[PDB]
Amino acid sequence: YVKKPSYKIVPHFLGFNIPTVSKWIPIFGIWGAAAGIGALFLIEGVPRTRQDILSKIPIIGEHWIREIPASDNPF
């Protein structure tokens, strides 16, 4: 014979609890990647982005190492 139902209240705040949020953690991860790729893509033209980030990527990085010949440069 069972006298009482067996349960606990999980901690929660603003209607979020850990079991639910934990299911969404990977989704925040992917959104973060999306935002990172997006942001980096938006500033790919910025010379500092090329110098500091993009040209350092192995193999691929030579795409962003481009020199104007001194003969063709007024400045």
Add this chain to the structure above:
Amino acid sequence: FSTAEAAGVKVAAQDGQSPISDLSVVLRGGSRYATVPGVSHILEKFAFQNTVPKSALRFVRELELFGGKLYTHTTREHIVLRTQFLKQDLPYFVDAFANVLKETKFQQFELTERVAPVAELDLLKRESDPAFTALEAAHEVAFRTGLGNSVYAQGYSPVTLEDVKEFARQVYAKQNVAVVGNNVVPADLQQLVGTAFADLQEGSKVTQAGTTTLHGGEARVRTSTGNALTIALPIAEPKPVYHALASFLGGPASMPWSVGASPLAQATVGTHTSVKATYHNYGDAGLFAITIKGDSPAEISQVAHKAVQALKDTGAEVTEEQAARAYAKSKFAAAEAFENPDSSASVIGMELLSGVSRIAPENVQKFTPAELSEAAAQLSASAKPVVAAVGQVHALPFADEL
């Protein structure tokens, strides 16, 4: 069902071999005892509202964890509160009933927002059937008060929180409470009820204000929900012969797409109407009713005349075959009533609260053709015929015409 007593409360239980138990509290608090019209319906709807130990919300959330269900209804005699659950969860359900009976906080907002709206939808759903209405109106004409009180709360007569609180003070008391356990170990229930319901007031037996009176007349209820007509005959001497009579007369088909061999069923032939003979034993009085519902008022009028003729024909002569068929139909009806949990609870409830020993289906009396003829003759020669037309009442029959 082994009847016992546990802390002044009558407890009846029958053990079984099933994972499912039904526990019912039967209260002597049906509408015949109602202080104000509708109060017994409102009290029934107030069961499992907020109690001091456990809110309505918490109860429902916990009931879902046990997978239990809750059923409540009101009759002219009882309020029945039933729970269905797995066998092992018995102590929880006993404690929940105790909380309801001892510690219901009857709050005004629950009445306005929760209880009265649910009571109103309950009634509207029942009234969708004009046959329900016709048979309710027939009780009102026949008995006026007591048995003639409405079972359900109506809008025209408002029940107040003070009304419901007063009635509950009378009803929720050891003298008016019976516990009925289906598939419950009887010794275990007695121990639990004995600890849980020990501090319930003793109170006194609720009584009907006034003696039951028998009347005749008409009740024309203009609706547009459909058409129905009850030919009711109030009985001053409740006899078991009218059970076999109702069964014999019949009305509903025994098989799909058929009419049925019963006299009343053979009065609907050619029409799209439906008849049903019903006997309502109420201990001190009785009511024999023939309810004809249908689409066409003209069709109903035809069947109604055949219905009264059928009753007269029975009063003349029943065959031995017809008498045997009445016994068979009546034994079966008794059996299925004692099986159905809703009706089962009230049957033992009557035995515990009054003292009317139940008639086991195997002990249903066989009435001779002579006995059945006597019964029908008494009804054909009733000095108080009651008619209750519902619908297009201008086109439905009157008491004088039948």
